[PDB]
Coordinates of all heavy atoms in Angstrom, one line a residue:
Chain A
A21 N -6.2 15.3 9.4 CA -7.2 15.9 10.3 C -8.6 15.9 9.7 O -9.6 15.5 10.3 CB -6.8 17.4 10.6
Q22 N -8.7 16.3 8.3 CA -10.0 16.2 7.6 C -10.5 14.9 7.5 O -11.7 14.6 7.7 CB -9.8 16.9 6.3 CG -9.5 18.4 6.4 CD -9.3 18.9 5.1 OE1 -10.1 18.9 4.2 NE2 -8.1 19.6 4.8
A23 N -9.6 13.8 7.2 CA -10.1 12.5 7.0 C -10.6 12.0 8.3 O -11.6 11.3 8.3 CB -8.8 11.6 6.6
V24 N -10.0 12.1 9.4 CA -10.5 11.6 10.6 C -11.9 12.3 11.0 O -12.8 11.6 11.4 CB -9.5 11.8 11.8 CG1 -10.1 11.4 13.2 CG2 -8.2 11.0 11.6
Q25 N -11.9 13.6 10.7 CA -13.3 14.2 11.1 C -14.3 13.7 10.1 O -15.5 13.5 10.6 CB -13.1 15.8 10.7 CG -14.4 16.6 10.8 CD -14.9 16.9 12.3 OE1 -14.1 16.6 13.2 NE2 -16.1 17.3 12.4
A26 N -14.0 13.4 8.8 CA -15.0 12.8 7.9 C -15.4 11.5 8.2 O -16.2 10.9 7.5 CB -14.5 13.0 6.5
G27 N -14.8 10.8 9.1 CA -15.1 9.4 9.5 C -14.2 8.3 8.9 O -14.6 7.1 9.1
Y28 N -13.2 8.7 8.2 CA -12.2 7.6 7.7 C -11.4 6.9 8.8 O -11.2 7.4 9.8 CB -11.2 8.3 6.7 CG -12.0 8.6 5.3 CD1 -12.3 9.9 5.1 CD2 -12.2 7.7 4.4 CE1 -12.9 10.3 3.9 CE2 -12.8 8.0 3.2 CZ -13.1 9.3 2.9 OH -13.7 9.6 1.8
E29 N -11.2 5.6 8.5 CA -10.4 4.8 9.3 C -9.0 4.8 8.7 O -8.8 4.2 7.6 CB -10.9 3.4 9.5 CG -10.0 2.4 10.1 CD -10.6 1.0 10.3 OE1 -11.8 0.9 10.1 OE2 -9.8 0.0 10.6
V30 N -8.1 5.6 9.2 CA -6.8 6.1 8.5 C -5.6 5.3 9.0 O -5.4 5.2 10.3 CB -6.6 7.5 8.6 CG1 -5.3 7.9 8.0 CG2 -7.7 8.4 8.0
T31 N -4.8 4.7 8.2 CA -3.6 4.1 8.5 C -2.5 5.0 8.0 O -2.5 5.4 6.9 CB -3.4 2.7 7.9 OG1 -4.4 1.9 8.5 CG2 -2.0 2.1 8.2
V32 N -1.5 5.3 8.8 CA -0.4 6.1 8.3 C 1.0 5.3 8.4 O 1.1 4.5 9.2 CB -0.3 7.5 9.2 CG1 -1.5 8.3 9.0 CG2 0.0 7.2 10.7
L33 N 1.8 5.7 7.5 CA 3.2 5.2 7.7 C 4.1 6.4 8.0 O 4.1 7.4 7.4 CB 3.6 4.7 6.3 CG 5.1 4.3 6.2 CD1 5.5 3.1 7.1 CD2 5.7 4.1 4.8
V34 N 4.7 6.3 9.2 CA 5.6 7.4 9.7 C 7.0 6.9 10.0 O 7.2 5.8 10.4 CB 5.0 7.9 11.0 CG1 3.6 8.6 10.7 CG2 4.9 6.9 12.1
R35 N 8.0 7.8 9.7 CA 9.3 7.4 9.9 C 9.6 7.5 11.5 O 9.0 8.3 12.2 CB 10.3 8.2 9.2 CG 10.2 8.0 7.6 CD 11.4 8.6 6.9 NE 11.2 10.0 6.8 CZ 12.1 10.8 6.3 NH1 13.3 10.3 5.8 NH2 11.9 12.1 6.2
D36 N 10.5 6.6 11.9 CA 10.6 6.4 13.3 C 10.9 7.7 14.0 O 10.3 8.0 15.1 CB 11.7 5.4 13.7 CG 11.9 5.2 15.2 OD1 11.1 4.5 15.8 OD2 12.8 5.8 15.8
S37 N 11.7 8.5 13.4 CA 12.2 9.8 14.1 C 11.1 10.9 14.0 O 11.2 11.9 14.7 CB 13.4 10.4 13.3 OG 13.1 10.6 12.0

Side-chain angles (χ1 to χ4, degrees):
Chain A
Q22 294 176 57
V24 172
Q25 173 78 8
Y28 286 100
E29 174 177 343
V30 177
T31 297
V32 299
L33 173 70
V34 294
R35 294 194 283 175
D36 180 77
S37 61

